[PDB]
Scaffold this motif. Structure first.
Motif, PDB file in Angstrom:
ATOM      1  N   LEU C   7      -0.484  -7.724  -5.981  1.00 40.30           N
ATOM      2  CA  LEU C   7      -1.064  -8.873  -6.962  1.00 40.30           C
ATOM      3  C   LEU C   7      -1.972  -7.680  -7.952  1.00 40.30           C
ATOM      4  N   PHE C  20       0.179 -12.192 -10.226  1.00 43.60           N
ATOM      5  CA  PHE C  20       1.352 -11.073  -9.631  1.00 43.60           C
ATOM      6  C   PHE C  20       2.278 -10.650 -10.387  1.00 43.60           C
ATOM      7  N   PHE C  89      -8.799 -13.964  -5.098  1.00 42.90           N
ATOM      8  CA  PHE C  89      -7.493 -14.366  -3.781  1.00 42.90           C
ATOM      9  C   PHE C  89      -8.076 -15.902  -3.273  1.00 42.90           C
ATOM     10  N   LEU C  93      -5.005 -18.161  -6.677  1.00 43.17           N
ATOM     11  CA  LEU C  93      -4.263 -17.271  -7.417  1.00 43.17           C
ATOM     12  C   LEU C  93      -3.417 -17.838  -5.574  1.00 43.17           C
ATOM     13  N   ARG C  94      -4.331 -18.148  -4.299  1.00 44.21           N
ATOM     14  CA  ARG C  94      -4.018 -18.671  -3.069  1.00 44.21           C
ATOM     15  C   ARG C  94      -3.304 -18.108  -2.269  1.00 44.21           C
ATOM     16  N   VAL C  95      -3.897 -16.619  -2.124  1.00 45.74           N
ATOM     17  CA  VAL C  95      -2.646 -15.778  -0.989  1.00 45.74           C
ATOM     18  C   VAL C  95      -3.873 -14.749   0.107  1.00 45.74           C
ATOM     19  N   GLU C  99      -0.505  -9.578   2.946  1.00 50.20           N
ATOM     20  CA  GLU C  99       0.790 -10.500   2.623  1.00 50.20           C
ATOM     21  C   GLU C  99       1.353  -9.164   1.041  1.00 50.20           C
ATOM     22  N   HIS C 100      -0.075  -8.644   0.690  1.00 45.94           N
ATOM     23  CA  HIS C 100       0.089  -8.382  -1.172  1.00 45.94           C
ATOM     24  C   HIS C 100      -0.694  -6.845  -1.048  1.00 45.94           C
ATOM     25  N   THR C 102      -2.647  -4.685  -3.682  1.00 46.02           N
ATOM     26  CA  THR C 102      -3.084  -4.607  -4.575  1.00 46.02           C
ATOM     27  C   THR C 102      -3.488  -3.821  -5.667  1.00 46.02           C
TER      28      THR C 102
END
Lengths: 610, 374, 187
Positions: C7, C20, C89, C93-95, C99-100, C102
């Motif tokens: 992200l 992303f 978030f 973006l809906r994450v 998971e990511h 940043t």
């Protein structure tokens, strides 16, 4: 099974003194009814399609071979009269009620959406007096609103395909399922279904039950009339809030099929008059209120037709004698679980939670009397208090139905608003109510409830306008004045209130006019059913279906688990594990198990067995 | 029974409108008059009765002297008002206030004593579990189902203007204009004497109110309608008194409602209803003006005349920027909108936790109205 | 999946830009404002909501008072900033940050506490496997495909100047000029 020898063999014995059977449970109910001189209720959970009524015919066959002798010395205890068989017309009663109140659902092609309460009525001497049928709960929403891949009630589809010009011309229904906006998803033609013949058999069944051709045509005029409501299309006017209906034809077609002047119906529905003590002033309705009033009139007309139909069915169930007491048999849906769980699913789960609470209370008292019979005082919590928190979450002024009832009367209400208000008010304070909280694909459903069967996740979509049933007293007061006998007789109030304190609001009328939700009416009917069941001693049958296939030697384990969760058998096992479930005689315990403890168990002087 | 229900009462000057909550139409509507017998009666077997309230006073009108207790949104005498509430509860409604939460309506920019004494009379005269006092214009917005709009509310009481945006309220942009339908009644009897029709007592003062509520209309342009009044025709109308005297009224008929748009006629500097609406919108924040101009709501008893909406649309469109489209929503039934707004408001379960309870009054006294509500 | 993506969030004053890694252009661009309701509301059924973030604040503007949390490259309040990252978030973006990896952007000649508190909020408020804070001007050089150049970078934040030569950087020749597009708004 079910021969004369097997019923003769069971008679008067306890349930552990002959093999497991329904006849044994009915022997307990019949013997308790004679011994304790009180009413009893058999509760059978609604699995499929499962031949529940067919087994109930065997219960009726059991009651017939038991109840042959009472007060009257030589009262024709064999053949009754020329052919005084059972009420064989109980067989004929099912396709009539089944067409009216069963539908094709995702769980089964025939699923019962009403609470059928069969009252088998007895004199004080244990003989048959007669029988009545009562109907309590009904998914009256299912007429107007359906699920994404289900039929409405079978009667509508079988009417559309069966009826020839001979009867179609008189009802004006030749326009197929695409005309009628209350038939959601269109026709829903099942692969290789003719429908058609099923209503020839049903029409013959109605005529065998002694109803006239005129009555049968008049009934089917009103099953058209409930559909015809969805063809009325109000148009929201430029600037004016009220709206109006430009296309008279559907109202004129409805007026022909009913009894009304079109001009007075158009005024009464669009701009009704309300009694302003003692004058009458007009009320503006928005386009949404007028469509909801038309939906409420459809749902209430079908409700009144069904209540008349059960009353008219009881009028062909002859009564040869006065009655002193009854055996109830409840045939209703079980607790259901689908992927998409909507408002009617919450209503079904709520009735099953109250019915299961009555099972839990009955189990509590049965254990408590057995503790006392063996001389063991022991105190333990009620098992109906396991479910009380789930019931009080759904029920009451702060519960799910009340918050839904507030929100549907809120001036700009949304599905999102209902969920957020319920979250803020009650979710974070209620252990049995869960907000899931993942992103999409792990939580399509919008809130979750923990019930006896497990977690059930609900989709809120459209619950507010499913919930609405606001009923215009002016339009009801037009239907009361109907020149067609059937519709006037159906619309004969049925609320009793105007006899109590006379013509005012003195507590004898509920929320009637404006307001009125399906959830309130469902709670009100459920409370009437629960009071009548709570005034009897209950006995419990739980039906399971082993397969979709329709042939034995295969038992599908996952289906059996789902049925055991929904029917409360898994609750009953966790309940008896709180107590002491295994109960062994002092003689049996000594005689079977002496081999364990030769050191402890001494000589042949050790009698008494305690 | 669930909720118990509630009672809703609207008592702007001129008319009581009252009934249960969640009934859409009320259960009593009658004039807010207390009529006392001016002339001594010489018979045996009469009454006697101190006073007649509501329509008994309308019926027996000529014997009486009639007093409105509410003048300009202010209660001028409180036995006369208590009798009106005693009459609603026990004659038409036939309820005990002990059974029912009571919602009362109240006016923008009103002396605190009207709220504080009104709560005392409801708590200590007619024993009540809970109550609320609510601003009239917000209730009429609730009746027309809106979240946003500028409400022009006018009875036979006073004219009030409240702008609202997505709920909320702007206290600095609330305007009160002391012109009522009642001042129009006094203006109407004053103009009628030009044609020789002298009406002088309260009884025939309500006959000119009865003329006002069905012969009068607002001119769609004043000078144009006054010019064509040279050739009298449709502009003159016959009227029948309960005497049997025939009354014929002309230009007179539309120049009575004109006083709302021209307060120079009643002798007051205070700007017209179009201008006061503009004054409220100018006090409001720059962005919300766009929707307030297109969401003007008319309510009350003296917004009932033909041509008011049409005229207000010409005059606001002429004064305002024509870059945006002025839209007025003046529904039928607008005389009752404040009551309908209360009947919906008392039917909200969240609002059932917003009541002033009897216990809170008993613990903390009369001043708490302005500590919980508007 | 391979790489887990990453992200990328740019949050100079005035505008959040977010999306992303592996895209050439972002998924969310919106103003870095937190808008709290100055005027008390008198209705039933409203919200309530403490504050409106992003373009809910742009839409409902007249009721509100609007606060930028980032002034001259400095974060002036951190509940307002946390709400902006919470909003990126979970709304557009809906994450899950779990998971990511940043990546955050940060300004030339900025107090150490802006980096040190920013890493704490990313590690301890929104649980994250890994992160990085990177100087704004070097990122804009990478976007323009160049190894060498002098970057003049200016938002509604502050104006920064970074010279670069075949990669590297010269710390003594980095200049900060406290003139922003925001000061031009006030002008």
């Amino acid at each position: 099974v079910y021969n004369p020898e097997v019923v003769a063999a069971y008679r008067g014995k306890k349930r552990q003194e002959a093999p497991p059977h329904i006849f044994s449970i009915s022997d307990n109910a019949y013997q308790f009814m004679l011994t304790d001189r009180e009413n009893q209720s058999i509760l059978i959970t609604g699995e499929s399609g499962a031949g529940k009524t067919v087994n109930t015919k065997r219960v009726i066959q059991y009651f017939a071979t038991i109840a042959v002798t009472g007060d009257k010395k030589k009262e024709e205890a064999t053949s009754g009269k020329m052919q005084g068989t059972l009420e064989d017309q109980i067989i004929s009663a099912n396709p009539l009620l089944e067409a009216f109140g069963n539908a094709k659902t995702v769980r089964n092609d025939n699923s019962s959406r009403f609470g059928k309460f069969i009252r088998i009525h007895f004199g004080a001497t244990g003989k048959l007096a007669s029988a009545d049928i009562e109907t309590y709960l009904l998914e009256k929403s299912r007429v107007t609103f359906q699920l994404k891949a289900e039929r409405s009630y079978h009667i509508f589809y079988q009417i559309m395909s069966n009826k020839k010009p001979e009867l179609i011309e008189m009802l004006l229904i030749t326009t197929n399922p695409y005309d009628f906006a209350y038939v959601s998803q269109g026709e829903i033609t099942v692969p290789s279904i003719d429908d058609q013949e099923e209503l020839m058999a049903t029409d013959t069944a109605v005529d065998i039950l002694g109803f006239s051709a005129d009555e049968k045509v008049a009934i089917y005029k009103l099953t058209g009339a409930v559909m015809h409501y969805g063809n009325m299309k109000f148009k929201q006017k430029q600037r004016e809030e009220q709206a109006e209906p430009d296309g008279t034809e559907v109202a004129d077609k409805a007026a022909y099929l009913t009894s009304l002047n079109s001009a007075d119906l158009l005024k009464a529905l669009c701009y009704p008059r309300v009694k302003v003590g003692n004058e009458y002033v007009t009320k503006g309705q928005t386009v949404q209120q007028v469509y909801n009033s038309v939906g409420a009139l459809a749902k209430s007309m079908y409700e009144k037709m069904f209540l008349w139909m059960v009353t008219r069915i009881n009028q062909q169930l002859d009564t040869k004698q006065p009655r002193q007491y009854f055996i109830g048999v409840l045939d209703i849906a079980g607790f259901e679980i689908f992927d998409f769980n909507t408002l009617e699913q919450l209503c079904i789960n709520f009735t099953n939670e109250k019915l299961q609470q009555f099972f839990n209370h009955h189990m509590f008292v049965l254990e408590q009397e057995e503790y006392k019979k063996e001389g063991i005082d022991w105190e333990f919590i009620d098992f109906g208090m396991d479910l009380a928190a789930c019931i009080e979450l759904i029920e009451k002024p702060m519960g799910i139905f009340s918050i839904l009832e507030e929100e549907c009367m809120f001036p700009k209400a949304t599905d999102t608003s209902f969920k957020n208000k319920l979250y803020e008010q009650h979710l974070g304070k209620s252990n049995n109510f869960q907000k899931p909280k993942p992103a999409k694909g792990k939580a399509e459903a919008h809130f979750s409830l923990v019930h006896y069967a497990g977690t059930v996740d609900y989709n809120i979509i459209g619950w507010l306008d499913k919930n609405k049933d606001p009923l215009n007293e002016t339009v009801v007061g037009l239907y009361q004045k109907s020149g067609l006998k059937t519709l006037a007789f159906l619309f004969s109030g049925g609320q009793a209130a105007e006899a109590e304190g006379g013509g005012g609001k003195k507590g004898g009328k509920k929320k009637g006019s404006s307001f009125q939700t399906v959830s309130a009416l469902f709670r009100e009917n459920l409370n009437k059913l629960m009071t009548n069941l709570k005034s009897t001693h209950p006995h419990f049958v739980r039906c399971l279906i082993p397969n979709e296939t329709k042939t034995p030697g295969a038992m599908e384990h996952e289906l059996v688990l789902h049925q055991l969760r929904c029917n409360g058998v898994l609750e009953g096992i966790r309940i008896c594990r709180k107590g002491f479930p295994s109960r062994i005689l002092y003689a049996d315990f000594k005689q079977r198990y002496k081999v364990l403890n030769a050191s402890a168990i001494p000589e042949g002087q050790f009698i008494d067995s305690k | 029974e669930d909720e118990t229900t509630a009672l809703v009462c609207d008592n702007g000057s001129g008319l009581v409108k009252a009934g249960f909550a969640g009934d859409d139409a009320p259960r009593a509507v009658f004039p807010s008059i207390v009529g006392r017998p001016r002339h001594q009666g010489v018979m045996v077997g009469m009454g006697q009765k101190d006073s007649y309230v509501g329509d008994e006073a309308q019926s027996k009108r000529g014997i009486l002297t009639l007093k409105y207790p509410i003048e300009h949104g202010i209660i001028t005498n409180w036995d006369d008002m208590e009798k009106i509430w005693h009459h609603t509860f026990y004659n038409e409604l036939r309820v005990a206030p002990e059974e029912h939460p009571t919602l009362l309506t109240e006016a923008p920019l009103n002396p605190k004593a009207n709220r504080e004494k009104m709560t005392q009379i409801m708590f200590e005269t007619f024993n009540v579990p809970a109550m609320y006092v609510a601003i009239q214009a917000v209730l009429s917005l609730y009746a027309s189902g809106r979240t946003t709009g500028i409400v022009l509310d006018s009875g036979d009481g006073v004219t009030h203007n409240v702008p609202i945006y997505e709920g909320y309220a702007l206290p600095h942009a609330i305007m009160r204009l002391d012109l009522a339908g009642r001042d129009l009644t006094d203006y109407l009897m004053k103009i009628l004497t030009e044609r020789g029709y002298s009406f002088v007592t309260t009884a025939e003062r309500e006959i000119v109110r009865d003329i006002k509520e069905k012969l009068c209309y607002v001119a769609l342009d004043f000078e144009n309608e006054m010019a064509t009044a040279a050739s009298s025709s449709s502009l003159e109308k016959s009227y029948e008194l309960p005497d049997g005297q025939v009354i014929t009224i002309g230009n007179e008929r539309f120049r009575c409602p004109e006083t709302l748009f021209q307060p120079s006629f009643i002798g007051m500097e205070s700007a017209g209803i179009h201008e006061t609406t503009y004054n409220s919108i100018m006090k409001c924040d720059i962005d919300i003006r766009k929707d307030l101009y297109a969401n003007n709501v008319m309510s009350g008893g003296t917004t009932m005349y033909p041509g008011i909406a049409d005229r207000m649309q010409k005059e606001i469109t002429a004064l305002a920027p024509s870059t945006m489209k002025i839209k007025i929503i003046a529904p039928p039934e607008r005389k009752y909108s404040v009551w309908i707004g209360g009947s919906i408001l008392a039917s909200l379960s969240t609002f059932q936790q917003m009541w002033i309870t009897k216990q809170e009054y008993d613990e903390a006294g009369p001043s708490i109205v302005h500590r919980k509500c508007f």
